[PDB]
């Protein structure tokens, strides 16, 4: 039936700034929040402010040296940390900005708090749109991600769940989460992403895990222009097969919105309905679910996507006419919640989609 939803948000998150021209805009989390408050969704869910995750919490995965560096580095002392910055991959893609460590603490606090709430059976679904920073590595920042809140949230879930399923619908391969759990069968990682001359360069369908983790890493590489119909015809069958074979007792769904049509960095052609169809599919399995954010660089579309996905999590129909909000002008010229796909060519032929699905089904038979 309808589910209890716990949502994590800190009013300060929107003030963190990556720098002039950087595509990652934490302000998009504030726009999402303001939009869902104006739709009245606060009436249907419990809103929590996450705690700031500590160094102890972060070192359940990350190295002590890397976390000590993140806690120390500031724009005023960068000159003294030149060598350290290069070692930890902090610089241009992952800049040093005012309050960087606090931003990591808030993003992580929401994911970990959500996992705790699910473990305690106090909620059916936990939502943290400030989370989903899937590229961060044990001792290195990557692709705008510094602390891997997902890996930390999964490790929390593993205290009470023998098998955890991770699903990543961000346009980028969730390399950091895959790497952390590559040699274990206690976490199955499933990533759908653009592959071929595209960041981070990983996620080939032949990357299937290693040792005890062999067959517990699933990658669906895609080309430019995938649309709602093509994505929907592959997502439901793959996830259904994964659920049948793997039988997880908890799920983590990374909802990176950069897979939408018109994204600044992405080259997919999904609409908000096409993207949210994934949430709907995962929700039908009735398992404890942690929903996270991630990418999304055309910020009006990110707010639309995550507001609709929160409404989907709540089983609450919301009108297409956007209600007035603090960021109403960002939603012009239509002021509608839903988006139209572009006329871009879908390079993912129906035969290519079926072939990759068939190849992944062969791997799933090995479970
Ligand atoms: C200016 C920073 C980099 C020097 C530059 N990155 C980008 O163009 C851009 C960043 C960038 C673009 N502009 O202006 C057009 C910037 C302006 C200032 C700072 C950074 C950027 N980076 C990339 O696309 C990707 C990262 C994508 C991360 C997605 C994260 C997620 O999956 O969605 C989850 C949260 N990285 C790159 O392309 C980097 C590293 C590999 C080699 C090529 N790269 C780049 O040319
Ligand atoms: Ca992905
Ligand atoms: Ca694995
Ligand atoms: Zn992304």
């Amino acid at each position: 039936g309808k589910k209890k939803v716990c949502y994590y948000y800190d009013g300060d998150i929107g003030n963190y700034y990556y720098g002039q021209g950087h595509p990652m805009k934490p302000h998009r989390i504030r726009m999402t929040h303001n939009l869902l408050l104006n739709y009245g969704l606060y009436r249907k869910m419990e809103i929590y402010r996450p705690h700031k995750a500590t160094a102890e919490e972060m070192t359940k995965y990350h190295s002590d040296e890397y976390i000590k560096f993140l806690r120390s580095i500031r724009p005023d002392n960068m000159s003294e940390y030149s060598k350290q910055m290069q070692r930890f991959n902090v610089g241009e893609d992952c800049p040093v900005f005012d309050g960087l460590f606090e931003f990591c603490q808030l993003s992580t606090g929401g994911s970990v708090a959500g996992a705790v709430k699910l473990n305690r059976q106090q909620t059916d679904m936990a939502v943290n749109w400030a989370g989903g920073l899937h590229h961060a590595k044990k001792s290195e920042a990557s692709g705008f991600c510094y602390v891997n809140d997902i890996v930390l949230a999964i490790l929390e879930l593993l205290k009470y769940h023998q098998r955890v399923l991770y699903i990543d619908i961000d346009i980028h391969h969730g390399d950091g989460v895959e790497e952390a759990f590559y040699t274990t069968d206690r976490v199955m990682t499933v990533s759908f992403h653009k592959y071929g001359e595209y960041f981070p360069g990983t996620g080939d369908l032949r990357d299937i895990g290693a040792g005890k983790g062999k067959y517990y890493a699933v990658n669906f590489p895609m080309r430019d222009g995938i649309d709602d119909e093509s994505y929907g015809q592959i997502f439901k069958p793959i996830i259904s097969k994964v659920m049948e074979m793997y039988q997880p007792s908890a799920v983590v769904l990374q909802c990176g919105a950069d897979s939408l049509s018109g994204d600044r960095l992405g080259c997919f052609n999904l609409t908000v309905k096409g993207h949210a169809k994934c949430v709907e599919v995962v929700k039908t399995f009735n398992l404890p679910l942690l929903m996270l954010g991630g990418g999304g660089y055309t910020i009006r579309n990110v707010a639309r996507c995550w507001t609709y996905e929160t409404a989907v999590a709540l089983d609450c129909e919301i009108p297409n006419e956007l209600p007035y909000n603090d960021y109403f002008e960002y939603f012009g010229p239509d002021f509608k919640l839903h988006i139209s796909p572009s006329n871009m060519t879908n390079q993912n032929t129906p035969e290519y989609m079926e072939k990759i699905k068939q190849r992944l089904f062969e791997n799933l038979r090995m479970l």
Side-chain angles (χ1 to χ4, degrees):
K2 288 201 167 184
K3 313 288 213 313
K4 188 175 167 189
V5 172
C6 290
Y7 166 102
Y8 295 82
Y9 175 76
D10 190 301
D12 294 344
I13 205 78
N15 302 319
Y16 296 94
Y17 188 57
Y18 275 65
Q20 187 177 41
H22 196 293
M24 177 59 90
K25 298 177 190 308
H27 177 63
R28 76 209 167 116
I29 310 299
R30 179 161 49 201
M31 291 174 59
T32 299
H33 187 71
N34 194 258
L35 188 52
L36 60 92
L37 282 188
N38 278 291
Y39 265 112
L41 301 170
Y42 63 89
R43 296 194 282 267
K44 294 184 171 188
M45 73 187 165
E46 289 196 325
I47 299 175
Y48 292 97
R49 188 181 198 151
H51 65 288
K52 282 184 204 294
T54 67
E56 253 182 18
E57 289 175 90
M58 294 178 185
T59 61
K60 286 298 164 179
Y61 178 59
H62 299 278
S63 68
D64 291 333
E65 323 85 71
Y66 175 52
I67 298 309
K68 265 129 83 187
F69 165 81
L70 289 182
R71 286 205 311 201
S72 311
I73 195 64
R74 280 175 265 113
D76 65 80
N77 68 15
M78 262 169 86
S79 52
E80 303 147 60
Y81 278 94
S82 64
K83 169 74 186 179
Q84 289 73 15
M85 284 184 66
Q86 271 156 193
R87 193 215 296 197
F88 297 124
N89 193 37
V90 170
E92 278 108 54
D93 232 23
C94 303
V96 173
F97 56 85
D98 284 335
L100 166 63
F101 189 66
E102 289 191 280
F103 168 83
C104 298
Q105 294 184 285
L106 288 173
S107 163
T108 300
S111 304
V112 176
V116 170
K117 199 86 176 153
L118 290 158
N119 277 348
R120 288 173 77 190
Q121 303 168 182
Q122 275 165 23
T123 195
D124 295 310
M125 283 182 277
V127 181
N128 176 31
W129 298 124
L133 301 187
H134 58 176
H135 302 296
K137 306 295 192 305
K138 176 178 176 169
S139 304
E140 186 196 293
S142 175
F144 326 152
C145 309
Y146 308 80
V147 173
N148 206 312
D149 64 288
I150 312 171
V151 170
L152 294 168
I154 291 169
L155 287 170
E156 175 58 43
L157 293 170
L158 289 172
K159 285 175 183 161
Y160 296 89
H161 296 273
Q162 187 58 219
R163 290 174 313 274
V164 174
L165 168 61
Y166 171 70
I167 304 159
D168 189 315
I169 66 172
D170 192 280
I171 196 170
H172 300 93
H173 177 231
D175 62 334
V177 186
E178 182 183 278
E179 183 178 285
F181 301 116
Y182 212 59
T183 62
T184 188
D185 59 354
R186 292 199 55 211
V187 182
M188 175 170 267
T189 63
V190 182
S191 179
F192 299 85
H193 41 269
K194 174 177 156 68
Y195 182 78
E197 286 207 292
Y198 199 65
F199 187 89
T202 50
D204 187 286
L205 86 167
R206 294 161 291 192
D207 290 340
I208 61 153
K212 276 179 203 172
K214 197 193 183 181
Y215 303 113
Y216 296 92
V218 178
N219 287 296
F220 199 122
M222 286 162 183
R223 302 304 190 224
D224 292 348
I226 193 164
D227 58 20
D228 294 345
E229 202 175 66
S230 301
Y231 208 102
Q233 80 152 119
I234 247 62
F235 186 91
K236 191 177 175 193
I238 293 279
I239 301 309
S240 300
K241 193 77 207 175
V242 166
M243 290 292 193
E244 173 199 342
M245 301 302 302
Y246 189 60
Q247 290 154 242
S249 55
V251 184
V252 177
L253 174 63
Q254 196 271 21
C255 307
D258 50 9
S259 36
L260 296 176
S261 180
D263 187 82
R264 179 180 162 180
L265 301 185
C267 9
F268 279 2
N269 200 26
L270 303 185
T271 69
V272 168
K273 281 176 181 169
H275 195 270
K277 186 73 165 66
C278 302
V279 174
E280 293 171 30
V281 167
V282 175
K283 227 186 145 289
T284 71
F285 292 95
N286 299 309
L287 291 174
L289 174 56
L290 175 61
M291 294 173 61
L292 308 171
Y297 309 100
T298 293
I299 69 181
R300 65 193 180 271
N301 293 339
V302 174
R304 282 174 163 124
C305 196
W306 293 345
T307 293
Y308 189 66
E309 284 169 348
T310 304
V312 164
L314 289 168
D315 280 293
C316 174
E317 292 163 348
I318 54 167
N320 191 38
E321 181 77 354
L322 290 173
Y324 185 68
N325 62 85
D326 286 351
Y327 308 107
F328 198 70
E329 70 284 11
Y330 288 61
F331 301 102
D334 55 286
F335 307 105
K336 301 301 165 64
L337 176 66
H338 292 290
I339 66 171
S340 287
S342 80
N343 59 359
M344 74 176 307
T345 296
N346 183 2
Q347 290 186 39
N348 302 280
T349 64
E351 292 79 26
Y352 173 92
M353 299 302 293
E354 289 297 318
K355 191 66 183 178
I356 300 304
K357 184 173 58 67
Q358 230 57 63
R359 287 190 184 190
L360 299 180
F361 274 13
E362 282 192 59
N363 294 336
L364 290 168
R365 285 205 294 276
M366 300 311 293
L367 280 221

